Amino acid sequence: ESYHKPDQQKLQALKDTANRLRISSIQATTAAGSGHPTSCCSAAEIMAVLFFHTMRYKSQDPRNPHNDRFVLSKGHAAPILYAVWAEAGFLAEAELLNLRKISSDLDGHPVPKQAFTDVATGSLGQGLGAACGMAYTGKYFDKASYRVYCLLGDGELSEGSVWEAMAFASIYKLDNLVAILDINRLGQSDPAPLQHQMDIYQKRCEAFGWHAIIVDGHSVEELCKAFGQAKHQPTAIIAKTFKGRGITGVEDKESWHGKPLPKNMAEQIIQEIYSQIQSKKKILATPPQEDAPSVDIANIRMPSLPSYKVGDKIATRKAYGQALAKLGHASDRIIALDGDTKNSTFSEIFKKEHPDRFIECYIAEQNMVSIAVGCATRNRTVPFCSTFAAFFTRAFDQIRMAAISESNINLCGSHCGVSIGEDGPSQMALEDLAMFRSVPTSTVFYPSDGVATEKAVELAANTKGICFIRTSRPENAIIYNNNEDFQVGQAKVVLKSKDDQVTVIGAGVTLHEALAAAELLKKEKINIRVLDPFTIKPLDRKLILDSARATKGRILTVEDHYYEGGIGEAVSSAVVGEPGITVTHLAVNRVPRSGKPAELLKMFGIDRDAIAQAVRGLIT
Amino acid sequence: ESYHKPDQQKLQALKDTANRLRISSIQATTAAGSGHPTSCCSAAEIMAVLFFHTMRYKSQDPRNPHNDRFVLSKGHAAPILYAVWAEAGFLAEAELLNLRKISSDLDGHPVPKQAFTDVATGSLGQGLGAACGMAYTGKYFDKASYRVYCLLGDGELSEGSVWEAMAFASIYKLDNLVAILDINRLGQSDPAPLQHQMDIYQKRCEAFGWHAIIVDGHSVEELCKAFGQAKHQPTAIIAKTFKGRGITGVEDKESWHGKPLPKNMAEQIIQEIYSQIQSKKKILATPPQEDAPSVDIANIRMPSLPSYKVGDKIATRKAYGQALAKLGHASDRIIALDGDTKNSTFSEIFKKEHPDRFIECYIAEQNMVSIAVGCATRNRTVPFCSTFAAFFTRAFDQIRMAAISESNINLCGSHCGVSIGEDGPSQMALEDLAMFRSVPTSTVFYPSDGVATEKAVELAANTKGICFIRTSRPENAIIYNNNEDFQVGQAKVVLKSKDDQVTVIGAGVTLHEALAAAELLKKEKINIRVLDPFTIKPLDRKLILDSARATKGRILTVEDHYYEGGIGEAVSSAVVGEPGITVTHLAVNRVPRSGKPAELLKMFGIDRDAIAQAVRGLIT
Numbered sequence A, B: 001e002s003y004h005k006p007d008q009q010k011l012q013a014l015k016d017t018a019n020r021l022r023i024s025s026i027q028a029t030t031a032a033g034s035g036h037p038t039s040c041c042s043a044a045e046i047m048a049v050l051f052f053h054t055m056r057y058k059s060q061d062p063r064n065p066h067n068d069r070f071v072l073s074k075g076h077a078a079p080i081l082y083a084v085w086a087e088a089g090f091l092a093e094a095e096l097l098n099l100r101k102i103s104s105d106l107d108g109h110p111v112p113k114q115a116f117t118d119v120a121t122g123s124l125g126q127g128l129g130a131a132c133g134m135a136y137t138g139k140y141f142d143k144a145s146y147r148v149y150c151l152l153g154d155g156e157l158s159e160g161s162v163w164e165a166m167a168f169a170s171i172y173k174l175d176n177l178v179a180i181l182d183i184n185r186l187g188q189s190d191p192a193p194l195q196h197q198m199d200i201y202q203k204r205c206e207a208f209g210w211h212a213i214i215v216d217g218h219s220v221e222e223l224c225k226a227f228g229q230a231k232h233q234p235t236a237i238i239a240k241t242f243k244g245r246g247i248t249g250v251e252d253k254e255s256w257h258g259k260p261l262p263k264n265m266a267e268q269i270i271q272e273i274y275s276q277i278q279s280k281k282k283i284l285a286t287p288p289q290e291d292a293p294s295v296d297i298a299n300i301r302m303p304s305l306p307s308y309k310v311g312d313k314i315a316t317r318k319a320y321g322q323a324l325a326k327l328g329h330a331s332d333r334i335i336a337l338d339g340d341t342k343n344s345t346f347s348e349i350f351k352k353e354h355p356d357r358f359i360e361c362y363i364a365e366q367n368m369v370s371i372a373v374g375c376a377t378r379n380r381t382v383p384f385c386s387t388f389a390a391f392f393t394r395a396f397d398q399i400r401m402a403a404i405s406e407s408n409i410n411l412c413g414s415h416c417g418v419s420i421g422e423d424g425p426s427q428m429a430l431e432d433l434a435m436f437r438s439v440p441t442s443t444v445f446y447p448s449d450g451v452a453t454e455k456a457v458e459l460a461a462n463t464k465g466i467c468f469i470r471t472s473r474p475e476n477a478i479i480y481n482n483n484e485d486f487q488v489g490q491a492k493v494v495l496k497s498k499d500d501q502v503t504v505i506g507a508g509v510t511l512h513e514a515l516a517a518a519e520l521l522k523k524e525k526i527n528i529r530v531l532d533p534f535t536i537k538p539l540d541r542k543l544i545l546d547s548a549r550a551t552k553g554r555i556l557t558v559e560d561h562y563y564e565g566g567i568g569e570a571v572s573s574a575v576v577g578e579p580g581i582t583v584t585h586l587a588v589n590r591v592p593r594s595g596k597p598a599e600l601l602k603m604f605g606i607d608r609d610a611i612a613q614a615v616r617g618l619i620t
């Protein structure tokens, strides 16, 4: 469609709209007693032009799949986001004054309980990554006409994650993506490093492969024109603005970030801004081209049961790749992402079978998680991202925000624990159980064999929230029948007798070490019950306690993870106070080192001999 | 100090050295059966020229404070780092063959148990930030002549944290820092995005303010010359190389990352490389200018006791800023770092009193932690970095690697929990105790008032490892006398009696809500013991159990944190199986929302009324 070059009356209406947005931002933050009106005011023309000239969307159906997407990366400007959606007619105007109240959903930073918000923002530097996932989806998966617009602050651009997204967008030719940089010179507590050196912002964007246009960010005409031209590259509109634009005495001043105007001042300033507004008549939003395809919502099932064989040896990292590739034959919704580790995580198998649905994210875990979050918005895809579990610590804030965003993403982290051997601790995940258990919408799968891994992949695909699958490097035996039934929150007793002395809880390599310990102990006429949790979160407290009650109330938990936040603390928290129950915990007590896998399990006290000694100790 | 322009015999010796380094990297990785010889071989001329032409260091004293610093950011090239230290005469040549053995300290990636290693690397993209800390220290604190050199991979440059470091270096004019980029075209599992588009690497480095020089990375002469000119800017040596350089048939080939040569192949290739070496005579290292100052190692003590009075009200975040500024008057080694949040964390108090020792890191938490790690190397400074606790999740991998680096850094995270109120969950730390408790060298301080905060700052300054101080936004009353003695691992019973029915454990805001609950329960003739842990890690289990035994074995924990990995799980894990002890937990069960602080404590079940109700329920 052709650009509609606005006339002076449309330009004036956009100016009027921007000033209404300023007034509302001040009124709401003054009513709340907190917030960021100066951060809203530098963006007012940008917001007016995007919502009332450039973008195409259904004002009464913000989540419509055909709509252009807007991502407010500088989330603290939430009051102006609320104001535009009131201006567009979706949000009642009076509700704007209930900003930050416990009786309102117009919270401090945007959240998806708001229909007009796809991803929660408020941790700076993450919105552009989500926007890149939306734009990739639009161009390559939905193959639709919608565009994606993301507004960033200039302080925000100090976050490395933004530059990961900038590079992603140029690698993948996201010519449907626009980043608007609100270059208002000041951060929270000092000027932003580059201040108003517009040329350096242009050079950085261009060096990263973007088409970069410097504009007066308070000129509705310049904004209409810059947004009005599509490009063959991702486009950066580098807008020179002033913080607190339009607030006399505050515009371009320090010491005003996150400071509301006191009532008396707000009244004077609003009268001043209102005096500039020529008409009360509001501009109407313009709707989109309806060319986004239908998407299936049904549960996704593996095309057949697992085809392993009991006794065969396979590492759960390889079983994950096999299983993910298999699931991709069952549904076109499954997509896979990996950070230059596909040959190690075995996500390469999925890339070989379904290349159109694999996204190489390179060595940039923060962005990879944000891409996945963006791809999962509006349920357009079911993403599985993978790397070594250790490197998901690099993306903890993106995972944290993903839960705040009520996102449904799946993450598979390999190479857990000391059992990887010789690479040493930089590559060993020893805190990932602690990390993912602390994510409030998480489900944590720790499959112990190839069958359980395939079942975990299938279950995760159909489970809402942040699903984590912990895979392993050692080649352990298949212990489960292919037709064993698996469920979230259901553990398995893999070894039992009537005279069991202790219930030993292990997972991945430590389950197999526990089974080996059981054989050692049998020689000593000592039987142990062995339990595989399957999911660490939620934990099968009932089976754990029923097992303990059959083994003199004694539990021993053994894990290839640090002591804090892992399996043993999960078990202790579940059963503390239960009459006659005792818990012994074996875990890794300090930063490891290099050696062979079996050597390290011995050094760190979680191998078959350490388990057997613990058991012999306990019976006394 | 003048450049020594090498003669052809020196150049030939540098080539011979590079080829010896190649041979050793192959021998060691073939002996180990794992490792990254192709990643070593692209860097061999770079390593030869740095260690045997450019750098100034004491070969028998790698930690000497006057030495130039070298950071191997692409840590998986460890075997060539080990080779250069053998070439320099510090390491025995035979030990190189023990790479990755449990009997050796020549681990898979570099670690500070090696005298020649300052910071552990292995998680890509972090070395440059550590190097920036070293360089900032050298120019501004030590005010010494040493230079800092950091070798990066090209896939590694996809990490946003690298760009944060690049921007830091140019803001702070680190004209004593050199980044060497090993542009060998290939990542782990595919070509790096830019491959050999050298001009784009130059453009990106220049846009970020570096002097950028493109060289042939296999030309010892071009490397000598590029390293031999000092600049007024941080300098990037953009070296065009080939992965596996010198390994016939493997050079510039995919499918060889992290793959050792089989024995038969190693023997053939080593014979060919050896045929290229003209002399067995080794180059000697050259010592440095000894102008680094003496630094004092003594215990650091506050110049006076805290000057708070019982009953006064102060937020622990403000007490932190006051305490930090006070300690800075006590010791010259204290430095403060903050990520554009100084007005919120109150690190601005330190900046005002000791501006030369404050480092503004901008909105870039991952780099901030790496800067601190670098500043703490060789014990040159005692850093305290601060931001909101939620945003330390952005730096979890840097914190993880800091522990692998045996680093002594101090972290203060403010704005914990729902008690911050209206900003909402993006700003709320609810997983920070889980996170830091999983860091194996950590000490976790959770001060409940101003006095405890000042004592925590003092103790942290003198405590090794990763110290975390969790501060709070509500103003709560001072409950401790100024002369109260505090120690790591020692809790305090702040309310007790002979007829206590429950031991309630709270911290920060929830300690105060517990005291309020006790006044409430007094109406009901019900007495409760209240315990302040002070440190969450390590926990005073003795005092907690002694308390529980005086209160019918009953413990209730209440915390402004998620359930997993926090205070309640620490306590449960500590007492599980103790006869007669029960533990009940109150925490935050899901992603919160905006409201007034008191309304959120109420909504999420961790206020005085929730505590009292829980107590009543235990008594029945």
Ligand SMILES: Cc1ncc(Cc2c([C@H](O)CO)sc(CCOP(=O)(O)OP(=O)(O)O)c2C)c(N)n1
Binding pocket: A038, A039, A042, A074, A075, A076, A122, A123, A124, A125, A152, A153, A154, A155, A156, A157, A182, A184, A186, A187, A188, A192, A243, A258, B339, B340, B341, B363, B391, B394
């Ligand atoms: C990763 C991360 N680190 C720190 C913060 C705290 C913070 C903010 C809170 O959302 C509201 O004050 S706003 C803010 C300053 C943002 O400055 P800019 O990006 O220049 O935006 P603005 O000038 O348009 O407000 C910080 C440092 C953050 N939100 N995220």
Ligand SMILES: Cc1ncc(Cc2c([C@H](O)CO)sc(CCOP(=O)(O)OP(=O)(O)O)c2C)c(N)n1
Binding pocket: A339, A340, A341, A363, A391, A394, B038, B039, B042, B074, B075, B076, B122, B123, B124, B125, B152, B153, B154, B155, B156, B157, B182, B184, B186, B187, B188, B192, B243, B257, B258
């Ligand atoms: C944050 C982070 N993400 C992923 C990895 C795994 C990894 C490595 C292991 O240390 C050794 O294989 S090396 C590696 C490839 C590095 O490629 P480059 O930076 O181009 O270096 P190189 O070509 O010089 O080897 C990856 C993806 C990593 N170490 N760190």
Ligand SMILES: [Ca+2]
Binding pocket: A153, A154, A155, A182, A183, A184, A185, A186, A187, A192, A243
């Ligand atoms: Ca700004």
Ligand SMILES: [Ca+2]
Binding pocket: B153, B154, B155, B182, B183, B184, B185, B186, B187, B192, B243
């Ligand atoms: Ca490379």
Ligand code: NA
Binding pocket: A408, A409, A410, A459, A460, A461, A462, A463, A464, A465, A467
């Ligand atoms: Na899922």
Ligand code: NA
Binding pocket: B408, B409, B410, B459, B460, B461, B462, B463, B464, B465, B467
């Ligand atoms: Na310390």
